[PDB]
Short mmCIF file of all heavy atoms in Angstrom, two decimals:
data_model
loop_
_atom_site.label_atom_id
_atom_site.label_comp_id
_atom_site.label_asym_id
_atom_site.label_seq_id
_atom_site.Cartn_x
_atom_site.Cartn_y
_atom_site.Cartn_z
N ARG A 4 64.50 -11.81 -47.25
CA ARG A 4 65.07 -10.53 -47.34
C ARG A 4 66.61 -10.65 -46.95
O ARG A 4 67.51 -10.32 -47.54
CB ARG A 4 64.39 -9.62 -46.28
CG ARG A 4 65.09 -8.12 -46.05
CD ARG A 4 65.26 -7.29 -47.20
NE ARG A 4 66.07 -6.12 -46.88
CZ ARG A 4 66.07 -4.88 -47.68
NH1 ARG A 4 65.46 -4.81 -48.78
NH2 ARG A 4 66.97 -3.92 -47.23
N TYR A 5 66.87 -11.32 -45.77
CA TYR A 5 68.19 -11.65 -45.17
C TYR A 5 68.99 -12.57 -46.22
O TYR A 5 70.22 -12.08 -46.45
CB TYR A 5 68.05 -12.44 -43.94
CG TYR A 5 69.49 -12.86 -43.35
CD1 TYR A 5 70.52 -12.18 -43.13
CD2 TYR A 5 69.70 -14.29 -43.11
CE1 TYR A 5 71.72 -12.55 -42.56
CE2 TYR A 5 70.85 -14.64 -42.60
CZ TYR A 5 71.89 -13.83 -42.39
OH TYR A 5 73.09 -14.25 -41.88
N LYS A 6 68.44 -13.28 -46.99
CA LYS A 6 69.05 -14.21 -47.98
C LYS A 6 69.48 -13.35 -49.35
O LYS A 6 70.53 -13.56 -49.70
CB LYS A 6 68.12 -15.42 -48.30
CG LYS A 6 68.65 -16.62 -49.10
CD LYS A 6 68.77 -16.35 -50.61
CE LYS A 6 67.34 -16.31 -51.29
NZ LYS A 6 67.40 -16.01 -52.61
N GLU A 7 68.59 -12.53 -49.62
CA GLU A 7 68.87 -11.44 -50.70
C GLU A 7 70.07 -10.55 -50.36
O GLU A 7 70.97 -10.34 -51.28
CB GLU A 7 67.67 -10.56 -50.87
CG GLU A 7 66.23 -11.18 -51.26
CD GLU A 7 66.40 -12.11 -52.46
OE1 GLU A 7 66.74 -11.69 -53.70
OE2 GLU A 7 66.32 -13.36 -52.27
N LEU A 8 70.11 -10.10 -49.01
CA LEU A 8 71.24 -9.34 -48.47
C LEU A 8 72.61 -9.85 -48.67
O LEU A 8 73.49 -9.30 -49.18
CB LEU A 8 71.04 -8.99 -47.02
CG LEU A 8 69.68 -8.25 -46.72
CD1 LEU A 8 69.52 -8.01 -45.20
CD2 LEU A 8 69.49 -6.91 -47.58
N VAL A 9 72.73 -11.27 -48.35
CA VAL A 9 73.94 -11.93 -48.43
C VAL A 9 74.37 -12.18 -49.92
O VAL A 9 75.39 -11.80 -50.28
CB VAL A 9 73.77 -13.45 -47.84
CG1 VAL A 9 75.14 -14.20 -47.82
CG2 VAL A 9 73.29 -13.23 -46.22
N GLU A 10 73.32 -12.54 -50.88
CA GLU A 10 73.65 -12.77 -52.26
C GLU A 10 74.19 -11.55 -52.89
O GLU A 10 75.08 -11.57 -53.75
CB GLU A 10 72.42 -13.37 -52.91
CG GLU A 10 71.81 -14.73 -52.46
CD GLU A 10 72.84 -15.81 -52.46
OE1 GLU A 10 73.29 -16.24 -53.52
OE2 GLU A 10 73.19 -16.30 -51.44
N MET A 11 73.61 -10.41 -52.56
CA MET A 11 73.83 -9.14 -53.08
C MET A 11 75.34 -8.73 -52.74
O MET A 11 76.08 -8.32 -53.64
CB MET A 11 72.87 -7.96 -52.87
CG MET A 11 71.61 -8.32 -53.45
SD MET A 11 70.38 -6.85 -53.17
CE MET A 11 70.07 -6.88 -51.41
N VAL A 12 75.73 -8.73 -51.43
CA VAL A 12 76.93 -8.24 -50.93
C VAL A 12 78.04 -9.18 -51.38
O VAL A 12 79.26 -8.65 -51.55
CB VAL A 12 76.93 -8.14 -49.35
CG1 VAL A 12 75.91 -7.18 -48.80
CG2 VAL A 12 76.80 -9.52 -48.80
N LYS A 13 77.74 -10.60 -51.60
CA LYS A 13 78.82 -11.46 -52.22
C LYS A 13 79.08 -11.10 -53.66
O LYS A 13 80.27 -11.08 -54.06
CB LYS A 13 78.15 -12.96 -52.20
CG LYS A 13 77.95 -13.62 -50.88
CD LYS A 13 79.36 -13.87 -50.17
CE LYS A 13 79.28 -14.65 -48.87
NZ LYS A 13 78.69 -16.00 -49.16
N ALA A 14 77.97 -10.79 -54.52
CA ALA A 14 78.13 -10.42 -55.89
C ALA A 14 78.97 -9.14 -56.11
O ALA A 14 79.74 -9.01 -57.00
CB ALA A 14 76.76 -10.34 -56.58
N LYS A 15 78.73 -8.12 -55.23
CA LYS A 15 79.53 -6.85 -55.22
C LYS A 15 80.88 -7.07 -54.90
O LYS A 15 81.67 -6.69 -55.73
CB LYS A 15 78.87 -5.83 -54.13
CG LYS A 15 77.43 -5.44 -54.42
CD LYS A 15 76.91 -4.39 -53.37
CE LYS A 15 77.66 -2.99 -53.63
NZ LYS A 15 77.12 -1.97 -52.79
N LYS A 16 81.32 -7.69 -53.77
CA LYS A 16 82.65 -7.91 -53.32
C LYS A 16 83.43 -8.89 -54.27
O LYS A 16 84.65 -8.48 -54.55
CB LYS A 16 82.61 -8.55 -51.95
CG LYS A 16 84.10 -8.83 -51.30
CD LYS A 16 84.85 -7.48 -51.11
CE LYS A 16 84.44 -6.48 -50.02
NZ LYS A 16 83.21 -5.74 -50.42
N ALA A 17 82.85 -9.69 -54.94
CA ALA A 17 83.40 -10.64 -56.04
C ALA A 17 83.75 -9.81 -57.16
O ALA A 17 84.86 -9.86 -57.72
CB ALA A 17 82.46 -11.82 -56.33
N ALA A 18 82.92 -8.88 -57.75
CA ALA A 18 83.03 -8.04 -58.84
C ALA A 18 84.10 -7.04 -58.60
O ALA A 18 84.90 -6.73 -59.49
CB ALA A 18 81.65 -7.35 -59.14
N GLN A 19 84.12 -6.52 -57.27
CA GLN A 19 85.07 -5.45 -56.93
C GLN A 19 86.48 -6.13 -56.80
O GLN A 19 87.54 -5.39 -57.18
CB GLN A 19 84.73 -4.88 -55.52
CG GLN A 19 83.46 -4.09 -55.39
CD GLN A 19 82.89 -3.92 -53.97
OE1 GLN A 19 83.25 -4.69 -53.09
NE2 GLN A 19 82.22 -2.92 -53.83
N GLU A 20 86.61 -7.38 -56.59
CA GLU A 20 87.75 -8.23 -56.57
C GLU A 20 88.35 -8.61 -57.92
O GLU A 20 89.60 -8.81 -58.11
CB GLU A 20 87.63 -9.56 -55.70
CG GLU A 20 88.84 -10.40 -55.50
CD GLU A 20 88.69 -11.51 -54.68
OE1 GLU A 20 88.22 -12.68 -55.13
OE2 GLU A 20 88.81 -11.61 -53.54
N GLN A 21 87.33 -8.60 -59.00
CA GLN A 21 87.80 -8.84 -60.33
C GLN A 21 88.34 -7.59 -61.03
O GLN A 21 89.27 -7.78 -61.75
CB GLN A 21 86.51 -9.38 -61.18
CG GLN A 21 85.77 -10.64 -60.72
CD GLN A 21 86.63 -11.82 -60.23
OE1 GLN A 21 87.70 -12.08 -60.87
NE2 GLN A 21 86.39 -12.61 -59.35
N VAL A 22 87.75 -6.49 -60.59
CA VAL A 22 88.32 -5.10 -60.99
C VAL A 22 89.66 -4.90 -60.26
O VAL A 22 90.52 -4.38 -61.02
CB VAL A 22 87.28 -3.96 -60.43
CG1 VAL A 22 87.88 -2.58 -60.70
CG2 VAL A 22 85.88 -4.17 -61.06
N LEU A 23 89.78 -5.41 -59.18
CA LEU A 23 91.18 -5.38 -58.32
C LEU A 23 92.10 -6.29 -59.11
O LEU A 23 93.26 -5.96 -59.38
CB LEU A 23 90.82 -6.08 -56.91
CG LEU A 23 92.11 -5.75 -55.83
CD1 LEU A 23 91.57 -5.89 -54.38
CD2 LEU A 23 93.25 -6.86 -56.05
N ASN A 24 91.77 -7.50 -59.46
CA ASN A 24 92.67 -8.37 -60.30
C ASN A 24 93.05 -7.78 -61.57
O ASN A 24 94.25 -8.05 -62.00
CB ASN A 24 91.75 -9.67 -60.60
CG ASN A 24 92.54 -10.70 -61.37
OD1 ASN A 24 93.28 -11.53 -60.84
ND2 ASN A 24 92.45 -10.79 -62.69
N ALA A 25 92.23 -7.12 -62.35
CA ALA A 25 92.40 -6.49 -63.63
C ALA A 25 93.39 -5.38 -63.42
O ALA A 25 94.33 -5.19 -64.20
CB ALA A 25 91.12 -5.96 -64.17
N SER A 26 93.36 -4.56 -62.28
CA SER A 26 94.11 -3.42 -62.05
C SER A 26 95.44 -3.77 -61.42
O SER A 26 96.51 -2.97 -61.29
CB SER A 26 93.37 -2.37 -61.25
OG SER A 26 92.79 -2.98 -60.05
N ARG A 27 95.44 -4.98 -60.71
CA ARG A 27 96.63 -5.60 -60.15
C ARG A 27 97.66 -6.08 -61.07
O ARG A 27 98.80 -5.96 -61.02
CB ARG A 27 96.27 -6.64 -59.05
CG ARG A 27 97.37 -7.25 -58.20
CD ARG A 27 98.27 -6.15 -57.49
NE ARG A 27 99.30 -6.79 -56.64
CZ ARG A 27 100.41 -6.24 -56.36
NH1 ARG A 27 100.85 -5.10 -56.96
NH2 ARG A 27 101.35 -6.86 -55.66
N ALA A 28 97.11 -6.92 -62.04
CA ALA A 28 97.92 -7.62 -63.13
C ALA A 28 97.28 -7.48 -64.45
O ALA A 28 96.06 -7.51 -64.58
CB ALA A 28 98.26 -9.05 -62.66
N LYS A 29 98.13 -7.08 -65.55
CA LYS A 29 97.50 -7.06 -66.88
C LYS A 29 97.41 -8.38 -67.57
O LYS A 29 98.15 -9.26 -67.22
CB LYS A 29 98.43 -6.03 -67.65
CG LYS A 29 98.51 -4.52 -67.21
CD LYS A 29 99.47 -3.63 -67.92
CE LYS A 29 99.43 -2.40 -67.45
NZ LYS A 29 100.21 -1.27 -68.26
#
């Protein structure tokens, strides 16, 4: 369960950061 929690929150934050990268620079 704990191991799933870490993998999920990593995947979310990484994806949010790619959306950030896209909106930061074209």
Side-chain angles (χ1 to χ4, degrees):
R4 172 64 184 196
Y5 173 58
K6 193 277 296 179
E7 301 306 291
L8 301 178
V9 181
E10 298 303 292
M11 290 185 297
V12 302
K13 289 296 187 62
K15 297 188 65 179
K16 181 59 70 282
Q19 296 166 330
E20 184 179 88
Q21 307 309 327
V22 176
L23 190 160
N24 179 89
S26 54
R27 181 58 180 144
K29 298 184 181 186

